[model samples]
Target: SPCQKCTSGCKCATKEECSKTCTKPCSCCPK
Candidate 1:
């Protein structure tokens, strides 16, 4: 089970604020 993890330089309280959450519901590492 893999999910999109938030990874950004922005300093937000949560993923919602940082907008770093996975775009897709499923995990698909985009490069």
Candidate 2:
């Protein structure tokens, strides 16, 4: 699937949360 940015644009705390919420936790993203 094509990767997308977080809808909330919120800085995530972890890659796990980023995937679930599409938010960057710590300047990192997931596939």
In terms of TM-score, the best-performing candidate is 2
Question: Which sections of candidate 2 miss by over 4 Å?
Answer: 1-11, 23-31
Error of 1 at 26 (Å): 20
lDDT, candidate 1, 2-29, per-residue tens: 2434343323344454445444322233
* Model 1, residue pairs in steric clash: none
Off by over 4 Å in 1: 1-10, 20-31
For residue 13, what is the lDDT in candidate 1?
49
Estimate, for each residue in 1-31, the C-alpha lDDT of model 2 and write its tens digit: 2234544364455676666755444334453
Give the candidate number with the greatest lDDT. 2
Note the Cα lDDT for every prediction shown.
Answer: 0.37, 0.49
For model 1 the TM-score comes to 0.23
Per-candidate TM-scores read 0.23, 0.27
Per-residue error (Å), model 2, residue 2: 15
